[PDB]
Amino acid sequence: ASILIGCRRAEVARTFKEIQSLIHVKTKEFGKTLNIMKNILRGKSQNLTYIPRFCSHLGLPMQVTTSAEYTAKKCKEIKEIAGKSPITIAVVSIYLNILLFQIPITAAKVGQTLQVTEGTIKSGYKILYEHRDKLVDP
């Protein structure tokens, strides 16, 4: 929880499954200790950063990265579903921005690399394809 706090303070983005992959903290007790720790920090007185990291995990060009940035912000403005945790919004945003071009990764490889369910990226790809209209940057 101290590492995650130091990550949130330095404008860095690290998912719970990453520190969880490093340390087995059993999630629940991790969430409670992180909550009461946040209360300690408050007593002593942002998903956009995740896009370039996963684009680095897939090795995508810069145009797909900033395209997933504009897609992430716009999808944050459109509402509907709102988020269901920002990780799935990130992976479906990169999934749409990569299905707009021709670089092929399909859904299984991106689902096993980023540790996301295929049915979730297709469930988000459905309504995302429904909102494809207002997501075009150029």
Binding site: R14, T15, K17, E18, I19, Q20, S21, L22, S56, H57, L58, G59, T113, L114, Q115
Partner: protein, 132 residues
Amino acid sequence: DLDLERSNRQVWLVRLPMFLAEKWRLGKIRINKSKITLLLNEPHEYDLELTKKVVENEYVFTEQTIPKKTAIVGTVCHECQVMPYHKIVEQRRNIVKLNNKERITTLDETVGVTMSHTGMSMRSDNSNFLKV
């Protein structure tokens, strides 16, 4: 119960070249009366030098505190050494001086994949080792 069988048997010791020795791991010796050769099977003929004429205090035994079954074979009679289409053998001897090793392979990928596999990659377990 060690027993000397005969020792009267006369044996000749031979220092062979490596390809024919590893091949032995049949021919016909031609004794020419002070120069003797060898006609192998098709293939070369080989002059064998009388390396050491007098060869005493040297014998041969076989094995079938912990005593084991010991048998005596025969006395060593003559120390010998086989001497050697020789251009092909000379080229093979020049050819053995060309052994090399493989160099380090450079991974050519987009780096971000390997660097993603370095640190936290949201992928744990997948292998049972020191899991108690």
